[PDB]
Amino acid sequence: KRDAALPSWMPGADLPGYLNGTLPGDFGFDPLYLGQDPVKLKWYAQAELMNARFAMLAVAGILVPELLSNIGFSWPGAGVAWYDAGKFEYFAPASSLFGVQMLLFAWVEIRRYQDFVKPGSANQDPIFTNNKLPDGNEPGYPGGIFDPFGWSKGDIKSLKLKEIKNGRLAMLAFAGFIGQAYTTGTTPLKNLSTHLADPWSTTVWQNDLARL
Amino acid sequence: RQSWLPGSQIPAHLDTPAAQALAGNFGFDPLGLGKDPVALRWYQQAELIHCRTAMAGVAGILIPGLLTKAGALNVPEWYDAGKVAIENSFAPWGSLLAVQLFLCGFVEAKRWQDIRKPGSQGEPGSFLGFEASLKGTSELGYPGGPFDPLGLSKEADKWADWKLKEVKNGRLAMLAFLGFVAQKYATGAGPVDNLAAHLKDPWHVNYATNGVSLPFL
Amino acid sequence: DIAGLTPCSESKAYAKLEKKELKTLEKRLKQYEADSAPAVALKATMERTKARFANYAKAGLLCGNDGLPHLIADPGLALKYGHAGEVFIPTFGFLYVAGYIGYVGRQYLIAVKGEAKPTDKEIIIDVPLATKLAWQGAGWPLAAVQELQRGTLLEKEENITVSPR
Amino acid sequence: KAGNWLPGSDAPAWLPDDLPGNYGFDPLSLGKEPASLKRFTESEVIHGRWAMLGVAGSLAVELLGYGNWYDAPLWAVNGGKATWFGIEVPFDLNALLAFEFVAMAAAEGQRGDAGGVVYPGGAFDPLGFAKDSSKSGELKLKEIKNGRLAMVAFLGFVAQHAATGKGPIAALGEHLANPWGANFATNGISVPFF
Numbered sequence: 013k014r015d016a017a018l019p020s021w022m023p024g025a026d027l028p029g030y031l032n033g034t035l036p037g038d039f040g041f042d043p044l045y046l047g048q049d050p051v052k053l054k055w056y057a058q059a060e061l062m063n064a065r066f067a068m069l070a071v072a073g074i075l076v077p078e079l080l081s082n083i084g085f086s087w088p089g090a091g092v093a094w095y096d097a098g099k100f101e102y103f104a105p106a107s108s109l110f111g112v113q114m115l116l117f118a119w120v121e122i123r124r125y126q127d128f129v130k131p132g133s134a135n136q137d138p139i140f141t142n143n144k145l146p147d148g149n150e151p152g153y154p155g156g157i158f159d160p161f162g163w164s165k166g167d168i169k170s171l172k173l174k175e176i177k178n179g180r181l182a183m184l185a186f187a188g189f190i191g192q193a194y195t196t197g198t199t200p201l202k203n204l205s206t207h208l209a210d211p212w213s214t215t216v217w218q219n220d221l222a223r224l
Numbered sequence: 225r226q227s228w229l230p231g232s233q234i235p236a237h238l239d240t241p242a243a244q245a246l247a248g249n250f251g252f253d254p255l256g257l258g259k260d261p262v263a264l265r266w267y268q269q270a271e272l273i274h275c276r277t278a279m280a281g282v283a284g285i286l287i288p289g290l291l292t293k294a295g296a297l298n299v300p301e302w303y304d305a306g307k308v309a310i311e312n313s314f315a316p317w318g319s320l321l322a323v324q325l326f327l328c329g330f331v332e333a334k335r336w337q338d339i340r341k342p343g344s345q346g347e348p349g350s351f352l353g354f355e356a357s358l359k360g361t362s363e364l365g366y367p368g369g370p371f372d373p374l375g376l377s378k379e380a381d382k383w384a385d386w387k388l389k390e391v392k393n394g395r396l397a398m399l400a401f402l403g404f405v406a407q408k409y410a411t412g413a414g415p416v417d418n419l420a421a422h423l424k425d426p427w428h429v430n431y432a433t434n435g436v437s438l439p440f441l
Numbered sequence: 442d443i444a445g446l447t448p449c450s451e452s453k454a455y456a457k458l459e460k461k462e463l464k465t466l467e468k469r470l471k472q473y474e475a476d477s478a479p480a481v482a483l484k485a486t487m488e489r490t491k492a493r494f495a496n497y498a499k500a501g502l503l504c505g506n507d508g509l510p511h512l513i514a515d516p517g518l519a520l521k522y523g524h525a526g527e528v529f530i531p532t533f534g535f536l537y538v539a540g541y542i543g544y545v546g547r548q549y550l551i552a553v554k555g556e557a558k559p560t561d562k563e564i565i566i567d568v569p570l571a572t573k574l575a576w577q578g579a580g581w582p583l584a585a586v587q588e589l590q591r592g593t594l595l596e597k598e599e600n601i602t603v604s605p606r
Numbered sequence: 607k608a609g610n611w612l613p614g615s616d617a618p619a620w621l622p623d624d625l626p627g628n629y630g631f632d633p634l635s636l637g638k639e640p641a642s643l644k645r646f647t648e649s650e651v652i653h654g655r656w657a658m659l660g661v662a663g664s665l666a667v668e669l670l671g672y673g674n675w676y677d678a679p680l681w682a683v684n685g686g687k688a689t690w691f692g693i694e695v696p697f698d699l700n701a702l703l704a705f706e707f708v709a710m711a712a713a714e715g716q717r718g719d720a721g722g723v724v725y726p727g728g729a730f731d732p733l734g735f736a737k738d739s740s741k742s743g744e745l746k747l748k749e750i751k752n753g754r755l756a757m758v759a760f761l762g763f764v765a766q767h768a769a770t771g772k773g774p775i776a777a778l779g780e781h782l783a784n785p786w787g788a789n790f791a792t793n794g795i796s797v798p799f800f
């Protein structure tokens with residue numbers, strides 16, 4: 013039932029009709045029919061954006077710090093694996109940092125949720141009432157102060173597709189960090205160097221068979 | 225029409241519009257226990273209370289157990305916690321239990337009287353202004369009001385799905401607790417210890433080799 | 442202990458009784474050869490006898506001066522001193538099975554009274570109908586209470602024949 | 607309407623606009639019935655007034671150096687003697703209970719008979735600040751807002767003392783000394799896995 017002009021995750025396949033192509037990154041992939049219900053699909057679309065944008069920040073926050081250390085840049089946190097950052101000594105105890113984090117994230121997340129329930133109802137600054145986001149925004153794409161450079165005024169449809177594509181790739185990358193670190197016990201870029209050193213004897217088959 | 229046993233004859237008393245409006249109706253009543261409509265209404269309340277208590281109880285055994293294994297917490301086995309807690313307690317278990325019966329008895333009595341006369345606990349003047357919030361909703365077993373702080377039940381388009389999830393997880397939790405009791409006697413270890421032992425060697429560590437469940441073999 | 446009794450595990454008469462019973466079997470076992478069938482049968486009886494006296498003592502039965510186990514029937518004494526498995530627990534075992542039989546039979550009787558010839562279903566059993574009712578009788582305690590609460594368990598006095606008075 | 611507790615939300619219809627301190631906050635719909643709301647309106651003001659006295663008293667004792675609010679009654683259980691601003695008070699615990707019960711019963715009995723008179727005025731308004739109706743609207747809002755703040759503050763005293771065991775003034779000093787090492791997240795009870 014899906015339009016044949018739309019791109020497909022499996023060329024030639026007959027895909028569900030409810031994925032009509034409005035959402036970005038709509039390739040008709042839903043073999044388990046999780047998004048069949050329109051009410052749940054609405055929630056999943058936002059959840060995909062949220063997990064996708066945190067994954068992109070997280071992946072960039074795990075490679076660049078490791079890349080800089082390998083280059084030679086020196087700073088107190090250099091050379092610390094992403095899975096050992098918790099034990100590192102910061103200016104404040106980790107417990108107090110977590111407490112501040114939840115209070116700050118309670119404010120912004122409840123503001124974001126208010127918009128999802130009633131879009132356009134959280135666009136106004138509560139203190140400096142003059143400030144406000146433009147009235148045309150949609151859930152998940154605030155704009156206004158969140159888009160200071162005005163990129164959203166261009167080809168928005170292409171930009172949203174680029175965002176979700178990079179986001180889906182970042183989500184897989186973070187899942188790779190968990191699996192690779194758990195099985196190899198080393199940082200992701202060290203794993204890449206091992207693979208490039210001898211690609212033909214460093215596959216997951218080679219590595220896991222040895223550990224078997 | 226989803227059934228617990230595809231191709232079997234669904235009981236007639238579970239195919240009525242009233243019965244099919246119950247959450248989790250898969251046509252399962254081989255003993256005909258719910259054949260009487262009045263009894264089915266009472267047993268539906270019993271299933272919800274067992275579901276919700278089992279879910280809270282099993283979560284109070286499984287989550288602390290998993291965290292204890294991970295080292296986040298240090299909680300004893302569910303079957304030893306009562307003794308450990310009472311030693312460091314401020315009251316003997318007899319006085320602790322008696323207070324529990326008084327407090328539980330009071331709220332259970334109010335729920336009991338609501339089953340017999342739905343909405344009757346909203347009788348003006350009975351409670352100190354709070355009776356208005358004790359009328360419940362149009363469905364027995366779903367009080368709402370102060371019992372639903374986030375107001376998730378107000379979403380009509382999601383109401384049927386919420387109820388099905390509750391009964392499905394509730395039925396699963398009840399079987400999990402029955403599994404904990406059986407596995408405690410069969411193996412003499414904790415539920416997470418049983419899970420780890422099975423995963424270590426699934427084909428040699430199970431109930432067919434515990435020496436209790438299958439005596440004929 | 443309870444009512445002047447003593448545990449069988451601590452009773453001299455109980456221990457003496459076991460010796461006499463085994464002694465009687467041992468005397469008979471002398472006239473048979475080691476591998477002969479009578480010898481095997483007698484030794485099997487001896488093993489069962491030793492297990493029996495071991496099990497009863499383990500169960501915590503009280504013995505009288507005669508050295509024989511005595512049962513405790515008062516629920517309070519039975520539950521206070523761990524004798525609930527003698528009378529109290531067996532009590533509810535029986536009543537469950539007995540009510541099961543009675544309830545299943547009552548259901549069959551009521552079911553066939555709506556047939557064309559009820560008396561023919563009482564000498565030629567409707568086995569398919571009887572079998573279905575037998576399996577559903579496991580929940581009789583629940584079903585019986587509901588009939589009692591619904592007022593359908595009993596018949597009204599106006600429909601029961603009585604003699605002149 | 608004082609304001610909105612949840613920007614973008616709709617105020618409940620059953621909360622009157624003129625009701626002082628009305629931010630449209632009733633997610634549980636406890637005040638939906640007019641009879642229930644009438645009782646709750648009085649109870650909130652009574653709670654707020656006691657909390658304002660309770661918080662002001664709790665701070666004054668510790669600021670003036672007579673200990674914290676929690677340790678004040680210990681003399682009645684450790685065999686001590688009562689003091690007020692340092693001067694001994696001859697009464698004992700049994701006498702205090704008897705006089706307080708009689709005095710409060712007479713005073714609270716009179717209030718109960720009035721039938722939910724939140725703002726009596728008259729003898730209770732000697733300076734006549736609320737004599738005018740037009741000005742009373744703003745003053746009632748200030749009373750309920752300071753009262754709601756005091757109720758939260760007292761809950762803070764009780765919760766903070768249970769976690770830390772120190773007085774409200776001592777806790778404030780400790781937080782000011784090491785803000786990032788002395789807070790609810792570092793007391794070892796509020797946040798579990800730390």
Ligand code: CHL
Nearest residue numbers: 094095096097098099100106107109110113295296799800
């Ligand atoms: C996206 C979320 C997220 C993820 C995936 C992780 C993942 C991880 N954190 Mg991290 N954290 C995350 C958010 C946060 N962490 C912390 C604070 C910490 C701390 C303080 C520690 C970790 C550690 C860990 C590791 C746990 C496994 C381990 O070694 O156990 C075995 C555990 C240990 C060997 C640690 C023993 C010493 C430790 C001081 C004991 C107390 C630890 C706390 C209970 C941690 C609580 C973390 C919770 C709040 C998220 C793992 C790599 C641990 C680590 O890096 O270990 C090498 C660690 O010590 N995290 C905060 C608060 C700012 C977070 C906030 O969002």
Ligand code: CHL
Nearest residue numbers: 225226227228229230231232248249250251252253395426
């Ligand atoms: C009230 C509970 C309940 C009960 C007692 C049954 C009972 C039954 N259902 Mg029913 N169902 C029940 C609820 C439900 N069923 C279904 C849906 C179905 C379907 C679709 C079917 C049945 C069928 C059956 C029968 C299977 C006969 C058998 O020997 O299977 C043998 C059982 C198994 C092979 C499963 C054993 C699982 C094992 C204990 C767990 C192992 C998990 C490990 C992870 C595995 C290890 C890893 C691997 C890789 C080695 C059986 C009479 C089947 C039938 O015969 O229908 C006519 C059937 O086709 N049921 C639903 C969903 C609506 C239910 C919801 O509550």
Ligand code: CLA
Nearest residue numbers: 184185187188191192195203204206207214215216217219
């Ligand atoms: C985002 C994609 C991605 C990438 C680029 C890599 C890259 C690498 N992985 Mg990792 N990995 C990923 C995801 C990824 N992984 C995920 C999701 C998991 C969880 C199952 C793992 C689990 C894993 C293990 C357990 C191991 C590696 C290892 C490796 C190395 C290659 C050898 C091997 O056995 O690969 C196997 C990798 C896979 C089977 C991942 C398949 C899934 C991805 C998403 C496929 C994407 C295909 C698509 C065309 C894009 C690829 C190219 C693009 C990125 C430019 C290399 C450093 C090995 C290593 O560290 O060697 C030293 C190793 O032992 N990975």
Ligand code: CLA
Nearest residue numbers: 443444513514515516517518519520521522523524529532
């Ligand atoms: C058939 C009649 C019958 C008779 C003659 C007895 C006789 C006795 N019972 Mg038993 N009992 C019976 C039926 C009977 N019981 C039944 C049907 C039940 C189940 C509901 C019980 C449950 C029960 C309990 C729970 C206890 C006894 C106890 C006793 C003994 C002392 C109490 C007493 O005065 O009882 C005379 C009996 C009656 C007047 C009839 C009603 C008895 C009620 C049900 C129990 C009264 C308990 C009593 C208040 C305990 C006081 C403290 C104790 C330490 C002495 C006494 C030998 C007590 C005992 O010694 O336990 C070791 C005890 O604790 N009985």
Ligand SMILES: CC(/C=C/C=C(C)/C=C/[C@@]12O[C@]1(C)C[C@@H](O)CC2(C)C)=C\C=C\C=C(C)\C=C\C=C(C)\C=C\[C@@]12O[C@]1(C)C[C@@H](O)CC2(C)C
Nearest residue numbers: 253254255256274277278281284285302305398399401402
């Ligand atoms: C309530 C419940 C469990 C509650 C558990 C709690 C509170 C546990 C609490 C604690 O653990 C903590 C947290 C911590 C510990 O330290 C201490 C304790 C105190 C121990 C289980 C119910 C468990 C209930 C169970 C298992 C019920 C199963 C019923 C079945 C299978 C019925 C089947 C049928 O009736 C049908 C539906 C139709 C008929 O026609 C046919 C038949 C077959 C008769």
Ligand SMILES: CC(/C=C/C=C(C)/C=C/[C@@]12O[C@]1(C)C[C@@H](O)CC2(C)C)=C\C=C\C=C(C)\C=C\C=C(C)\C=C\[C@@]12O[C@]1(C)C[C@@H](O)CC2(C)C
Nearest residue numbers: 632633634635636653656657660663664675678757760761
């Ligand atoms: C926190 C509090 C109440 C909070 C209520 C809340 C949040 C209710 C919220 C909601 O209901 C609404 C509104 C609407 C619903 O739809 C939703 C919910 C969410 C349900 C009351 C405190 C109330 C606090 C009060 C009254 C405190 C009184 C204190 C006194 C008198 C203290 C006296 C002394 O301290 C001295 C001075 C000296 C010491 O030595 C001795 C003593 C005796 C200790």
